[PDB]
Amino acid sequence: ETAQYSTSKTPYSPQQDIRTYQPPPPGFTAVFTELVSRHGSRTPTKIDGADLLLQLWAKARDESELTSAGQDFGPTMESYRAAIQKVGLGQETGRGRQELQGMADRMQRRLPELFEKIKKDATPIAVVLSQQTGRIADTAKFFTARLGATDPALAPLIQQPVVDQDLLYFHKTERGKAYRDYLENDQRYQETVKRIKNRDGTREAATDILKTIFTPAFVERMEPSAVTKAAQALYDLDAIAPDLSVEGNWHLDRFVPRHAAAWFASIDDAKSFYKKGPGFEGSDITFAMASILLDDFFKQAEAARAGKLGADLRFTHAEEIIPLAALMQLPGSEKQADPDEDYTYANNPWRGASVSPMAANLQWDIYRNGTTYLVRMLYQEKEIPFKPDCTPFTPGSHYYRLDELSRCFGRTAR
């Protein structure tokens, strides 16, 4: 566990040791692999919350309304702010680099026979991006540079990156138009978000957060709206602090009680569940747009039978991984909400931390024996089954015939 209450800011950790994956059936050897990964751990995209808190802190300091621990909040947040600005807002941290390096390491150690075959055949390793610059391009570079550092003979086969916004940025392209209209205009969705936001408990959690730093009287002198906003800002900065573990340790949990973090995490997860995840029973508005990416996993696997491509490496955002997982009914995303019963941690398994942590990723390994192609799926590098109407190669197996997967996803008849 890299973090307990950070939802989709949770830093990455592989969820299985590669030595415990099921081995491929006898005579099957790796011939293709393909990946889609969110960027690694990053800084906040905005600094305004840090300045809001630093301005509030300076006022309480001047009024002599700081707690004992609150004395150190100013220096702590100034230091944290400076580290964020030195990395750059919305940019990859040193932990994010380490995350992608680790994923590259385990891919090469998991499929040594594939990378030998790729060098034998001179087949390319494609690299595909959601956008041309930023944390996305750096994420890909962390991964591909590690592949080439471990195996310099692989480096000339790794292709220069290309951008495919329909494939890896669909929530912001034309594919996402109906989805965005739904968010803006659907009354049931708007009512549900409002209900989540108005859950009783935020005011108490917010005051519990501010009271680590400020006297109760200072907190009561604030406008309630300002209490909510400052507490949210501090929860957010505490939530993402683990992403910056390489840059420092600011012990921001001093200022966010655990019960308050748990509350704010449950609010974030509920909102994201409806905005981006499985959503309401019977509706695919939040994730049908991801069909192009599921399509592509199939398209590239079938192409690999044609011997063209060695591996396909794709890099994108949570806003692509989350809907892909709901569309595929991956573990954690298989349960849509009854409209008469709002999402809660008790009635639904969906969590940002497990569905879409930083460097959230899905991988398919394709193995061949004669004319038979088997697929094994890794999710956060845990070996997982496909949805239950897909039949494994043998009972209990995590390997699936590629033509069985095409059938059970409706691409073919049999």
Dihedral sign computed on CA atoms, order 148, 154, 156, 160 = negative
Tokens 């680790």 belong to 102
Tokens 């930023």 belong to 134
| CA–CA dist 77, 250 (Å, integer) | 8
| CA–CA dist 227, 222 (Å, integer) | 6
Distances (CA, A) of 196 to 8, 73, 173, 223, 340: 18, 30, 28, 21, 14
What CATH architecture is 18-409? 3-Layer(aba) Sandwich (3.40)
**Max CA separation in the chain (angstroms):** 78
3-state secondary structure 329-387: CCCCCCCCECCCCCCCCCCCCCCHHHHCCCCCEEEEEEEEECCEEEEEEEECCEEECCC
| CA–CA dist 310, 328 (Å, integer) | 24
| CA–CA dist 60, 50 (Å, integer) | 15
Write down the domain spans for the chain.
Answer: 18-409
| CA–CA dist 151, 154 (Å, integer) | 6
Dig out the tokens for 325 from the structure.
């997982």
Per DSSP bridges, beta strands 382-384 and 29-38 are unpaired
Distances (CA, A) of 137 to 133, 326, 368, 375, 377: 5, 25, 32, 28, 25
| CA–CA dist 234, 299 (Å, integer) | 44
Resolution of the PDB structure in angstroms = 1.7
For 274-360, strand residue ranges (E) read 311-316
Question: Which experimental technique did the depositors report for determining this structure?
Answer: X-ray
| CA–CA dist 242, 43 (Å, integer) | 10
Find the radius of gyration of the CA atoms of the chain. Answer: 23
> Which of 35, 1, 4, 37 shows the shortest CA–CA distance to 356?
37
Contact yes or no for 4/11 (Cβ under 8 A): no
